[PDB]
Ligand binder design. Sequence first.
Ligand SMILES: O=C1CCc2cc(N3CCN(C(=O)c4ccc5c(c4)OCO5)CC3)ccc21
Ligand SMILES: O=C1CCc2cc(N3CCN(C(=O)c4ccc5c(c4)OCO5)CC3)ccc21
Ligand SMILES: *Cc1c(COP(=O)(O)O)cnc(C)c1O
Ligand SMILES: *Cc1c(COP(=O)(O)O)cnc(C)c1O
Lengths: 429, 429
Amino acid sequence: GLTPEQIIAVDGAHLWHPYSSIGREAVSPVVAVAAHGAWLTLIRDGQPIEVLDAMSSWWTAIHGHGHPALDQALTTQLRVMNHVMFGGLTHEPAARLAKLLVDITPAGLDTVFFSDSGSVSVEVAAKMALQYWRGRGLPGKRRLMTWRGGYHGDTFLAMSICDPHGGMHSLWTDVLAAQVFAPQVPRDYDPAYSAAFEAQLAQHAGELAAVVVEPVVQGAGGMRFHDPRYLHDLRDICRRYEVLLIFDEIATGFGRTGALFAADHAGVSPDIMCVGKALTGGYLSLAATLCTADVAHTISAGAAGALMHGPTFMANPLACAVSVASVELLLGQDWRTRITELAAGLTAGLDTARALPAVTDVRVCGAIGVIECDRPVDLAVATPAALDRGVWLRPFRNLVYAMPPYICTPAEITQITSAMVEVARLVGS
Amino acid sequence: LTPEQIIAVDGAHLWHPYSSIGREAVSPVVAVAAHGAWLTLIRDGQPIEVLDAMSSWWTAIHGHGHPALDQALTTQLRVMNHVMFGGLTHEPAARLAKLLVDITPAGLDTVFFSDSGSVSVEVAAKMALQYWRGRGLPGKRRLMTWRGGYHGDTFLAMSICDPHGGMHSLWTDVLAAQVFAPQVPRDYDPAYSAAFEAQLAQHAGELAAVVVEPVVQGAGGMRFHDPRYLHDLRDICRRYEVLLIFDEIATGFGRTGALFAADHAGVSPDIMCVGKALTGGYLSLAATLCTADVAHTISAGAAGALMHGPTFMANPLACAVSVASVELLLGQDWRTRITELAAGLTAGLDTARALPAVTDVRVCGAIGVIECDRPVDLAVATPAALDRGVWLRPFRNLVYAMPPYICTPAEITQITSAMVEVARLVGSL
Ligand SMILES: O=C1CCc2cc(N3CCN(C(=O)c4ccc5c(c4)OCO5)CC3)ccc21
Ligand SMILES: O=C1CCc2cc(N3CCN(C(=O)c4ccc5c(c4)OCO5)CC3)ccc21
Ligand SMILES: *Cc1c(COP(=O)(O)O)cnc(C)c1O
Ligand SMILES: *Cc1c(COP(=O)(O)O)cnc(C)c1O
């Protein structure tokens, strides 16, 4: 047991944080002591305070924290089987989850590879695509193509398709694989961007295993939205040039953008698809890669005879059990109305920010609201300002944004957006 | 789902570790429960109890469903399932980091939490690369190892895995090209160390780090080597200014007779990975540790941070049960317990030496190996061990076990008796 000052002291000396230093942190982390529903209990000046988790703890807590259906599923599975190795064994929570995932994902995705994080599931997708083409006698098809502004994780193959500027690729000269980058995909649809994407793809087709993109919403690389018709063009280009299509739905999955999967906004099925952040409802680390029967059978008939990947905790019974409950909980309610109501609350609550002087754009897509500013947001100002108004907000670069839990009441959504407007206002003064 | 429905769902939709879809020689076995050292499997449609001789792939060091660990999980479930580690810290993370810093080899003072072993290896490599970039030497970007190793399934991890075990022939022109020394021998030979140093010397200017499994190489062949080899590496790396990374993801937490296998040699790496047994086999979690010198140099360099941060970084649920698992090991006389297990393994497997198809039998801590002159046929071995109440999963030519630390002498004699029989069926056909 540690007091908050003991925690801060341990943390300052021994704990790395995401994309952080040791010893050169401008602002200390805030101690978290509880989380229930949409609310975090944080320690501010020795005093516990309840604030709204407007970030859904980094896209994860779609049902809020400590939801009874998900707590219950965890403890139930813990009573019977915490974990067993997946090599040579199978179990009910894997079979239930996989049956769920093949049924609700874009059509044709019929096999499920479980792993422990989004980055790994992206590497697994790349491995599927590479082994698929080696199973076709075309080992030269080993590069990847994407469009700028994307983010696909932090392991070294995942990095190679992240936005070169956003992903600081200048720091990894002669280290990252050299992939093919198309220009930033625009917000509005423009058949000339698609024509130039195809023209660029056409000169790399024989060395391309796959096109890899986030569908409709690009997260960590800029919180940018783009017209779903672009994904329809990508599906057509990939079909005609025989390059596999891979959708990274690790951020967009499970209703977050107003459709169950963001690919549903275009009616597109990728050959391969990754899911992750909201898969467990924010309880535990879990991720999944799905492919079509065609990909699976080509890999399985190739010279390797198998997919050469196998995480230690593959298909962990506990993680799968809570994921089964989170997915069932979501499908058991009218999630699309819920998301629509969240979107309209974000849109209504954020409109006033458009007239703020340092604000260049406001945009909402499903349960995602973005205030885009004209200068980088100072976290040392923004974070305590939002805590002062009862909201946990985490700006990044010039963006003040929220992806709040689906269980947020309309009054709670208005409290979130109000704190976002006031952060935006402080930015410009 | 019934067992028959599980197997049907599984065969259609579920990938397994290093497996095919639709071409599996043998169906997986349905696991329905796991408690203590025992799994409950479905054979002939009926639940049977068998010993988890593999500790569920090195994980279940305290057995499944240990009441102390179940209760640590449920306790933390009541308070906080998860919050984001960007901008927040919490007591499970501080408690675990303080434990890990104090029990690991001297000098490892900072902890980077991730969700799997392969990710923790990529983090260590990223640590080493950013270290040398922060020292002005970006040319130091390659890794060196000895053959026979395994470090995970992500693409950078793959690049330092044994080329044959890791089937690098399938990956020509894909993997980063690393520096391999010959297989490290079992018995200590100073000429091996001189040849490693001479090879490293001509690469020292382009090498960021040596990466090895200390004492025991796992998935690459279950081979053991004299710890004096690790003393030699610490000296070579020190003198040639190349970082030393120990991969303790399978050897950690008492498995080889010392708390960490580095302690057999009395040396500290600069960077250290741990993972498989960290949570007592409950949940996915891993950690990468580095010295203060590495952390300060990364943080003072041009990037000013470590460019990594997974979504579920430092997950409260996984950290809580890991704190309980670690303190549970430390709160008993684990060194005697492992010594008793090693003796039980040696006494039980001795008779295998006489079998006509056995070329070696070796034990190291809670690890026992029978190496055969032929490959072990899983279609014969797995039912043969099942019929004797033991779950064994041979690999290539190896019949081996890594039993839970809670195994009684009668359970060990039962496991080893099963292992001897599998080897007897090998030299028969
Ligand atoms: O709380 C958490 C858990 C994961 C996390 C990542 C965080 N991010 C902050 C740093 N990030 C980045 O700057 C970043 C890295 C690579 C990129 C990128 C952005 O765009 C394209 O490629 C992305 C990760 C912040 C907080 C948290
Ligand atoms: O039950 C599980 C969880 C993870 C797992 C890996 C398993 N292994 C089966 C196949 N393996 C291998 O053949 C293997 C792969 C890469 C290598 C290697 C061996 O030596 C150097 O590089 C190692 C992975 C088997 C079962 C299970
Ligand atoms: C967060 C994210 C990842 C990485 O997942 P981790 O669990 O952090 O490894 C990959 N792709 C996308 C689109 C993401 O949003
Ligand atoms: C199992 C293992 C890994 C990879 O861990 P995962 O959790 O399966 O990704 C890495 N290194 C070593 C030595 C291992 O034994």
